[PDB]
């Protein structure tokens, strides 16, 4: 059965905007009230929608459980910009990793797609309001995010200004792995989507 979005954008639904188990295809119309609850941008959006309009099947799976972050705080990163029940919250499908006891060890994490289907994977970077917020959330002043796939190599540096998040996506082929490395400002994937063309 096809997913007909109301009031919410594809971007918003994929990331799991709080303000918003198998589907054939997804269509968002039009000029949705809720896009990204935390201010930001969704890169290569039109390209993704074009891709998502041609898929026969769409399924959400957990690839990196929230509980697997023992060295970082996976729940307390929340914003009043993304409220739930009157209190601060965040996107349900990606994780706002923040420092734990004023420490943010370097993250090196890989997930290999052993499914038989392509996986749509999403992640993000936080560009903090100012230098104080940078150390408050991530402790490390100078930070980076590296993302790699057999076909993809991305390196991000947070621009410190007004705070925004920037979200990215890729298609992870079967038997190909995605590799994340970061010492801060990383909005990590928890859930990904099996898609079939």
């Amino acid at each position, epitope marked *: 059965k096809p997913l007909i979005l109301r009031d919410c954008s594809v971007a918003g639904w994929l990331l799991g905007n709080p303000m918003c188990p198998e589907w054939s295809y997804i269509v968002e119309k039009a000029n949705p009230v809720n896009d990204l609850c935390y201010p930001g941008d969704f890169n290569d959006y039109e390209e993704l929608k074009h891709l998502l309009s041609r898929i026969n099947h769409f399924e959400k799976i957990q690839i990196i459980p929230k509980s697997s972050w023992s060295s970082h705080e996976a729940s307390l990163g929340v*914003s009043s910009a993304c409220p739930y*029940q009157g209190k*601060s919250s965040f996107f349900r499908n990606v994780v706002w990793l923040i420092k734990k006891d*004023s420490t943010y060890p370097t993250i090196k994490r890989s997930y290999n797609n052993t499914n038989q289907e392509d996986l749509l994977v999403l992640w993000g970077i936080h560009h903090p309001n100012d230098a104080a917020e940078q150390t408050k959330l991530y402790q490390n002043p100078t930070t980076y995010i590296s993302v790699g796939t057999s076909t993809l190599n991305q390196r991000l540096v947070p621009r410190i200004a007004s*705070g925004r998040m920037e979200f990215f996506w890729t298609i992870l082929k079967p038997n190909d792995a995605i590799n994340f490395e970061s010492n801060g400002n990383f909005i990590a994937p928890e859930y990904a989507y099996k898609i079939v063309k």
Partner: antibody
Amino acid sequence: QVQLQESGPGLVKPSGTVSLTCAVSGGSISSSYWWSWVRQPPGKGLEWIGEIYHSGNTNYNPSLKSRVTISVDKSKNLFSLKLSSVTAADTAVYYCARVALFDILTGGWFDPWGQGTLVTVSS
Amino acid sequence: YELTQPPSVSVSPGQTVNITCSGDTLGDKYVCWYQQKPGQSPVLVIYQDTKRPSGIPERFSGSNSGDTATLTVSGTQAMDEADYYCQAWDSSSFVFGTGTKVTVLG
């Protein structure tokens, strides 16, 4: 600017019930703020009692939870406190305050505060 | 969750005073500070660790690191004599510090 105003009985017998209301001016109860009660026994520190949202959702201090109730009236733009089974330990100045959430992380700050009202529990 | 403060500090007029507030992993939490004079309501002087509300003089500043948050008052005046409370949030509850009486020596 927003102002808050407490009112209610200033004298209460032991085992009785402290009953207060907070009138909100210059601003609406229906907003993104939380509405809180705080008390201060004379010569002592501030103690958080609890809070409420315009939706009716509440959070209470675990030590007062059994004997405390907070409610909200949206049309009258006020919220109220009921503290039952009171003893001398419940004698204090009671404050209402508006709570705003941080842009990021959990918690928030109290502003403005009401003028406070003294409630004495004594027979 | 507890927030511990020194019961009292004193400072000469024009000098700098530090009021400290400590608690487990306090550096991960945003802390706010309140000034309270006898017979008056608390007044917010610092929120979100460092921010000053409108109308609060520049000589009030705050910082938070490790397990300790600090309210700093420089060029302290007589009118700054008050009780000061830190405040944070832990596990569904707001918590106020035990309070510090600040005396401006006259």
